[PDB]
A paper describes a structure:
The scaffold protein [name], an essential cofactor, is a highly specific binding partner of MLL and MLL fusion proteins and is required to regulate the target genes of these proteins. However, small-molecule–mediated inhibition of the protein‒protein interaction between [name] and MLL fusion proteins may help ameliorate [name]-r or NPM1c acute leukemia by inhibiting proliferation and inducing differentiation. Here, we report the development and characterization of a novel, single-agent small molecule (DS-1594a) designed to target and disrupt the protein–protein interaction of [name] and [name] to inhibit leukemic cell growth and proliferation.
Thereafter, the crystal structure of [name] bound to DS-1594a·succinate was solved to reveal the molecular basis of DS-1594a·succinate-mediated inhibition. The structure contains 4 molecules in the asymmetric unit. It also demonstrated that DS-1594a·succinate forms a hydrogen bond with Tyr276 and engages in π-π or CH-π interactions with Phe238, Met278, Tyr319, Met322, Tyr323, and Trp341, which likely contributes to its target specificity. Our results demonstrated that DS-1594a·succinate could reach the target protein and inhibit endogenous [name] protein and the exogeneous HA-MLL1N1-1395 interaction at more than 30 nM in a dose-dependent manner.
Residue numbers in the entry:
A (entry chain A): 2 to 385, 402 to 459, 520 to 528, 548 to 582
B (entry chain B): 2 to 385, 402 to 459, 520 to 528, 546 to 584
């Protein structure tokens, strides 16, 4: 059941055609989530999944056009014919409206019961292939759901939202952590239910609320400061969900261009206002292919951080990682270290759980790979300056401080001997003359009155080893002992 | 143009009439594939595709007869009229002979060249419509090809083989994997051609030889132990290709019966002797409505395995699954677990490629659904016996060993979190008393020399070996097993 105002835009023969359909849909009060996902799903299938052009399928044709130099030549876009898309579309709605009898669910006050939402969730759930590998690229879109009955984790969430729209339930919306997804609904929008699995397979929590996740201060639930989406933001989600990767080292430039354009569309309508990750994703895309007259990536990264601070109580980690990354790839060592410090400064007030494995890996790689490497490549510059700058030393101490504070209160230790080496290796990359320029205090007087670097640890472990750090001989044994504990 | 010897059999007013026509055809040096496919297409059409008796239709007539009880009533069969079939038949042979000019290609010795076969394939390729975004039933037949141009993947191959018979090329024959189809020609039959696609997202190997697939030890090519049909088997193939699915939960009781009789007919003429799936197919049918004075289902599954061993080096998977299935349905836990274990043993010697996703799903459903069911429905029969027979436990370990072994040396991993839980759940289904009764030896001395016990089992896979002790322990180290069942030197 498409509206005639939707069909009038088909067939879509190019990137711009798709962008146009998105602008159309964002215009309406409730953009058709299922329609937009199908389209992106259809387009991604031929641009990344199966690029071999069929020539004996009815309704399937390819649209030639100039490709950008260097390459030059032609590029072939999959023509999204109405007949294919509409048929896919009707298969989804048929499946949904047939399996869910709203009559059985006394939906009063324009508010969806918890039982209704569990039901819809279960429909989508029981529809999936039992066998597939769940960590596979390109099973995010409803195209993939209807075609292959394969959905990735956050896909299931998105699909359950899309089902609810198709059922006329305008009160069920997609909630997004920085690494998980569920559903919110209810009068105030204050009711939650899990609908998908997280991590390695654990589909356990389906149906329950997210109260316990928020309470245990895990990064997965962002202490409550997760994203609650509106329809417009759900479109932003699926645009971010576009996966341009063909293989491990190869990207479809059409999918890159298209995701980039859709984000600017969204950006301009201001729908990335409360979406730090989107803004960062947009910035990442601008460093690759900078579209002219648009803000520089740096500006975008900052918009992301601003957003997190205004709307998410500055409880998001990735906005700083996004920025850190930039300064690493541009060799801005001082700024690069600062951002990593800022990142750690956020994680400090969280408690590390098993569910949080993803950010752990990210922090682990920062501490034990990105930072050590960064310093080496900077010591290669001198022996032929950041290493002379005690700010950078203070940044590095602040980074570890965050990590130690993070650990405090956690039901699982963070730091082990793996970290010990690299701390020492990294520490021993700053002349003892430089390290000593950093005063590590408590502060003597609170506040102010109208009438080298300084630094203050917040963690036990780090303030416990206040001196070992500024000494001229790195006591490479007492540090490793103290960084680790029980 | 039909021969005179064939027309005298129309009109086909019933199943038995269709049988008779088949008998006739099966008694020649070349049974007409095109004639028999068309007839089958036709009958399946009005029997599953569109069961509504046309009001506007002139030449289509329907024959009633008594229906099987309990339901009862009368069952109306679509009369295959000579005019219609001849028409369709003329249409096809016309279309094909129209597109190929046999003189363009020098065919010396009665041997067909690669070019000729490429073309005949191309002619079928650019005539059909592929149903890319859906799986369409009832589009296997040439009947479908002419009517709708719709043709599924293996339907293409069969179409090239029929089109070649229509051009009177008696050398081009049908190659049959367990989940693919291609074409064999050439002097001895050692010429291989790809004519169709496989699944979705796989590249395009049309025109090439299946050498690479044999090489890479993928199940799609059976390491070489695939079927090369003779005409008689190609007929058996299209009989298997009969498709009684009306919808997803409803079967055409008349198409079942037609197929069951056609297989028994092919069986008696000895045309199923080198076709394990056909023998499996028939057996499943005999489980449903057993025909009297015939072999038991059990007997037929074995003949399928037997066949597999004889002609195909025991490199086939389905023949075991066919047996396993029957056992599960009879709740013969012991045989079922065994049959599954044998299935794994065969597979152990394969590598796993993307194109094999079909046998994957199938193993997965065994590991993570079927076996678990069996054992859970058994813990109940005890509380109210196999779950304390260490034989069974051994079967279960051999199973897993094969899958692990399968995975070894594959481009893609095979095991993931999804499997981990049910392994553990199934290990726990046997008391540690029983699981310890099983001894897992590597072997100390090679071979023997001239001048009681419980189950003994040797693992072939590094994965199962490295976790031999964890399996027999009384405390099932749930966590450690799961960890080790997964691995990545990738
Ligand atoms: C460890 O070393 C380094 C790390 C980083 C770095 C830089 C940026 C990031 C953030 N990565 C983005 C990529 C993108 O997929 C973002 N994700 C997960 C999302 N983007 C947009 N919307 C969403 S919604 C969501 C939750 C879900 F998936 F729905 F459940 C997740 C999500 C996360 C992570 C790491 N950069 N540089 C490094 O070294 C130089
Ligand atoms: C996984 O759990 C269970 C599985 C099974 C089971 C039982 C039987 C099978 C084999 N299925 C048959 C059905 C039938 O279509 C057979 N097919 C594919 C063919 N039959 C005959 N000829 C051919 S030729 C061919 C390849 C092609 F199509 F030509 F390209 C395929 C093919 C295969 C597979 C699994 N049975 N029971 C189970 O639990 C009880």
């Amino acid at each position: 059941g498409l509206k005639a105002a939707q069909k009038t835009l088909f067939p879509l023969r190019s990137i711009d055609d798709v962008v146009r359909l998105f602008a159309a849909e964002l215009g309406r009060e409730e953009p058709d989530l299922v329609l937009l996902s199908l389209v992106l799903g259809f387009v991604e299938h031929f641009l990344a999944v199966n690029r071999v052009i069929p020539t004996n399928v009815p309704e399937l044709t390819f649209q030639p056009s100039p490709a950008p130099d260097p390459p030059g030549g032609l590029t072939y876009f999959p023509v999204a014919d109405l007949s294919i898309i509409a048929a896919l579309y009707a298969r989804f709605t048929a499946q949904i409206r047939g399996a869910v009898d709203l009559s059985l669910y006394p939906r009063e006050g324009g508010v969806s019961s918890r039982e209704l939402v569990k039901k819809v969730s279960d429909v989508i759930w029981n529809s999936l292939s039992r066998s597939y590998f769940k960590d596979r690229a390109h099973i995010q879109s409803l195209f993939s759901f209807i075609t292959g009955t394969k959905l990735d984790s956050s896909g299931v969430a998105f699909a359950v939202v899309g089902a609810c729209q198709a059922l006329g339930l305008r009160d069920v919306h997609l909630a997004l952590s920085e690494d998980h997804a569920w559903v919110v609904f209810g009068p105030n929008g204050e009711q939650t239910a899990e609908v998908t699995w997280h991590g390695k397979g654990n589909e356990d929590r389906r149906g329950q609320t997210v109260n316990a996740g928020v309470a245990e201060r895990s990064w997965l639930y962002l202490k409550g400061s997760y994203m609650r989406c509106d329809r417009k933001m759900e479109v932003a989600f699926m645009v971010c969900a576009i996966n341009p990767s063909i293989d491990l080292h190869t990207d479809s430039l059409e999918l890159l261009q298209l995701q980039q354009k859709l984000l600017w569309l969204l950006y301009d309508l201001g729908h990335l206002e409360r979406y730090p990750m989107a803004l960062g994703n947009l910035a990442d895309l601008e460093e690759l292919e900078p579209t002219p007259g648009r803000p520089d990536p740096l500006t975008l990264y900052h918009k992301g951080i601003a957003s997190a601070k205004t709307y998410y109580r500055d409880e998001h980690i990735y906005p700083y990682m996004y920025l850190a990354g930039y300064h690493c790839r541009n060799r801005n060592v001082r700024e690069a270290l600062q951002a990593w410090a800022d990142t750690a400064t956020v994680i400090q007030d969280y408690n590390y759980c098993r569910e949080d494995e993803e950010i752990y890996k990210e922090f682990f790689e920062v501490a034990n790979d990105v930072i050590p490497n960064l310093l080496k490549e900077a010591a290669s510059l001198l022996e032929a300056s950041a290493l002379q700058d005690p700010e950078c030393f203070a940044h590095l101490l602040r980074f570890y401080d965050g990590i130690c504070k993070w650990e405090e209160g956690s039901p699982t230790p963070v730091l082990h001997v793996g970290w010990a080496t690299f701390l020492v290796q990294s520490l021993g990359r700053f002349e003892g003359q430089v390290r000593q320029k950093v005063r590590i205090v408590s502060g003597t007087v609170a506040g102010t009155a109208r009438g080298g670097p300084v630094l203050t640890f917040q963690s036990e472990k780090m303030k416990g080893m206040k001196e070992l750090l500024v000494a001229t001989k790195i006591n490479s044994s007492a540090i490793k002992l103290q960084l680790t504990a029980q």
